[PDB]
């Protein structure tokens, strides 16, 4: 049972890697997007 | 008596680890779903960045 | 709710590429394929709510094809996985296979080897259990195990290589199964219960190949390298089987099988391989 | 009698090694779970930040639109009992950690979906400006 | 499939910063570096694990130039995975070091431990492996993750003891004890014996016997006592006997064998110096 | 703190759709429904802080309705779950049911089947324990078990099918309960013995001693742990007493079994039904 548990957690490490990378990537893109909407508002005024 | 106690402890720990295996299955399933949704999130964030940039250029 | 048939008809009308003079005035056809895919996904969702799971799968397949035509391959791979889930839940294992194969091809193209390996293993399971296409199941478990080995997921690789070696041994490819068990042993050394089983199964494959010397070497290797195999019932059983094979006594082998079964139940795989070994002894007696 | 005692010795030796086995998994599994639970913490921080940034985006987009053998048996059992105590404790700790992470993952999923929806909404709104 | 070489050539063409008069008319170069990074990531995905790693390194460098350091750190981790799977341990080290630097400036301990493992097992750069396990253990200690910190400090103390830094290894074992407990007591005492400080070994024995009842009645305690006694008598044969007796019941791993051999050699050297 | 009543009045004023000529000049009404929902959620949070849990639930229901009108169904489903939690904690089981039903409908429409199954099970628990609407509880446990079966979550599916079979047997649907126990057996060591026993008991309550004997033989052949179990011997003794028509011997075997392994309320009810069927056949023969 322990053996299987290790195996499953090794597998889940992989999911965690991708999730962390994607959410982190997304945050930086959202920050840039907000910057763009800020400059857009600055011009539209 | 010591060996019977040991057997009882091992049986209990087998039960706990069996419960854990069921829980880690639920955890792996949750993680597969979250990976899919985090991929969606990354795509949407890039799309939002690009759209905002296009509006920035439009207003300029 | 919208009618899914009308949604699919609208998807089909939008998914026609711009031909001729219209191609000079129409923007990228990508947006038309995206909207057709969205209409197909809406139809698929409605069919899924109706439990018309095969029609939902077919609608997701159409959506994924339109997503591919749009250039949105990551979406197509996800939609192929949704098609697969619908077909599997609908008992249409053939379309489930085709859906997973397209999804795996996309995932491998996106370098998502691990993801493809998860689905390649599930593909192997469908080939093994539902379609009984054992050859392709073997190929699926081998390739998934390799992709997991590249990802340093020793554990998933071992799960796949176990399935591969078991099926190869049941298909009579005893030497190749023994080689995969040697890989499983090496990947498991220094990490033990599965290991004993691996040593036993390796030896059994070698006996089924009528190579008792390799079985004896495997026994000696295991006894020297893993002390738990040295004192195990599996080692003693493998020894007793090697001895019975060298003596050509198919009855003594059957006795040792019964003795082992009384303490540690022989699963169906071991029974099949042990019967093959017995038959090889009896054939040498008859010859 | 001698043969049976020898068999008992072999059984307890094998059992001890396998007790120490169930241990390496538990310590590695807990280590990996600690690593992944912590990889979840970085995810959680980024999701919180994106929630704040989406609030800002909502308001900006809105404005844009407006604009000997006996002794060994005993000793092996000694060793097996001690290890068994840690296998039990590790199993309990692992169960607790999985419970906590399961609730955290549920919340991560919900927050990720909500953010995704908000982003699609603002992207569609920006498309029309 | 696109050709990865053509993708990399396009990435290289886009990743040229805007120089001169063009800098007055070009917007932020960040978007050009992002698009170059995306092209490099596509090439890496198509790749030939070492070439994939190199393409991810180029992508991460462009991501750094864009200001997207968190993305660069993730891409450095993907480069690392490709190089490690390709058997190029040097570029795996360099990738992990860049990723760790990004993560710490903003996880780094996880990767610093894996870096220590690469330094230990593939490159045999034991000094840097020690530094990696120590710093990872410290980062986990600040995070209150006692189990991971202890795993790192075990690796650090073991390598320090094998490198002859017996006193520092004993100090790390004292930290591990304060924070396996029987094993830690034994190893602490063994380091002290290898430092020819039998009095500190006897103190460690007494400490362990008083503070942990499970160590008091253990074989590890009796063995450490017998080794202290043999060291004080200067009897390297009695030490070898006690080592064989211990090994018959509880197999000595390679680390204990190395340290015990060092202790024996110190006894034999004192015997020779007295004749 | 803002007054929640004034917040709800502002939500109601904003949540009026743009009618007539104003619809040509007003942008999408979605933003108005979003802001009305936010005002309702603020009111609900204030009521929750006051422990006025039913009013918090009602405010979340209004918020979820506005979120639905905005097109934000995933948010509406979450808000319906918050309404449910408020009503359940407030002892208003009816509005808790209605909230869960709306949440489940949203989750199933979004393909979140597993999530909907969790809440469909909780709905079954409310129907069973608080409202005693056993028929709908049965339907809830069955459908949740099916959704978990599609999700390959054998353990949760089995938990639901156990609840379904137990309630079906207590409602006198003994054949259908036996069929669900056959599914639980096939999908499934300690619980397995219990499943065999309960299947046989349902069959005895249906006056089909032959099917009970077949279930006993099946279990004895397929699971060695059931073969030597007390549950197998007890089921055999009950089959024997039923075939002899001896309701006293059945009561003795029930007492013997109860002395070693306590009969829960379910088993007592089913065993009493079996006894009554024997006594009725005895009376019909005199």
Numbering used by the authors:
A (entry chain K): 213 to 257
B (entry chain J): 27 to 86
C (entry chain G): 1 to 191, 195 to 290
D (entry chain L): 433 to 499, 589 to 650
E (entry chain H): 1 to 47, 52 to 110, 115 to 187, 197 to 292
F (entry chain I): 1 to 188, 195 to 292
Passage from the reporting paper:
SNARE (soluble N-ethylmaleimide-sensitive factor (NSF) attachment protein receptor) proteins drive membrane fusion at different cell compartments as their core domains zipper into a parallel four-helix bundle. After fusion, these bundles are disassembled by the AAA+ (ATPase associated with diverse cellular activities) protein Sec18/NSF and its adaptor Sec17/α-SNAP to make them available for subsequent rounds of membrane fusion. The side-loading and side-release mechanism explains how Sec18/NSF can disassemble SNAREs with constrained topologies.
We prepared the y20S complex in a nonhydrolyzing condition and, after single-particle cryo-EM data collection and processing, we obtained 381,591 high-quality particles that yielded eight three-dimensional (3D) classes into which models were built. A characteristic phenylalanine side-chain density in Sso1 is present at the same position relative to Sec18 in all classes, allowing for reliable indexing of Sso1. The nucleotide states and the arrangements of D1 around the substrate were also the same among all eight classes, with the ADP-engaged E protomer forming the top of a spiral staircase of tyrosine residues. Protomer F, with no apparent density for nucleotide in D1, was not associated with Sso1. Given that this charge distribution is replicated between each pair of D2 subdomains around the D2 surface, it is unsurprising that the Habc domain adopts multiple corresponding rotational states over the eight classes, presumably because of the flexible linker that follows it.
